[PDB]
């Protein structure tokens, strides 16, 4: 719920201007909503925990990903899930857990999708 | 099994260009190979060999090729790149000598020159030959252009 | 100066590239053992059905 309302105004956002392709604001709505997109894409038979699913849509809509090219978003993705499922499998854990992002589990995933952006 | 960890943030800013296409193929390679590690389970299982062997008629042959299989052992392939380490070390000591060294001495000579440059006689207290011997590249040169005034007017 | 030091900071993390390489041709093999272990393992499992099919 946390992750997703964000995106759920933001995707609303982007609908609402997308008929036609100039200030800042309507610039970033449109490439924040490409990003989401090119986010949600999914392949067969591939579902995804809930957790991945959180720090997806997490990287996504906070705001790590308006540099990187649209046509990446996708390889990005399957990437960071690669990371972030073997070596911070104890924060994911921490959320399935207790089914909620706190503020140190929030901290922990923003250092690490930095981190993992970081090497690009 | 262990495998070294590694920050391409810093590793990125190591290659001449000169091999770096390459270098950028190696790291290419590396994600496909972890990715393909990643994928295959760490063991392949065993067999039912028992029960298989109760749902078989030639049940001897079963017997056989268990024993057999049992028997074989995957040759253990081997390394042949300690080479790469052989490459640590040369590239080591051409590092560490030249690169490292040349940045001594030259530093040594940039530290001598900021010492001269930080204590210049204030220029009031100076005379021409103290600046010709200071910027030598303010010398009006005599001798290719010997007669006055040695630069040409432009 | 300071193009000197960082410059030679360089050359103190060198070791990376080699490293990396290294990494690389590990598990390379590692890789391959576990997938000659599979065929082996697989192929006699496939040996063993066409006798059960039958």
Known sequence: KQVAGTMKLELAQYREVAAFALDAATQQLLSRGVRLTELLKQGQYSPMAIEEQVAVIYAGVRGYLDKLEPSKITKFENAFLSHVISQHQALLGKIRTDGKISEESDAKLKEIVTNFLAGF | ?154 | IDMEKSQQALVQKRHYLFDVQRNNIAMALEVTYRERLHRVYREVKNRLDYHISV
């Open chain 2, 1 to 154: 099994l262990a495998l070294k960890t590694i920050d391409w943030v810093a590793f990125g800013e190591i290659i001449p260009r000169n091999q770096k296409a390459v270098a950028n193929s190696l790291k290419s390679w590396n994600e496909t190979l972890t990715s393909r590690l990643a994928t295959l389970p760490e063991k392949p299982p065993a067999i039912d060999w028992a029960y298989y062997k109760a749902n078989v008629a030639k049940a001897g042959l079963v017997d056989d090729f268990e024993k057999k299989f049992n028997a074989l052992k995957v040759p253990i392939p081997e390394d042949k790149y300690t080479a790469q380490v052989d490459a640590e070390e040369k590239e080591d000591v051409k590092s560490c000598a030249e690169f490292l060294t040349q940045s001594k001495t030259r530093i040594q000579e940039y530290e001598k020159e900021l010492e001269k440059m930080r204590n210049i006689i204030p220029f009031d207290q100076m005379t021409i030959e103290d600046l010709n011997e200071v910027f030598p590249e303010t010398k009006l040169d005599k001798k290719k252009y010997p007669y006055w005034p040695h630069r040409p007017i432009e």
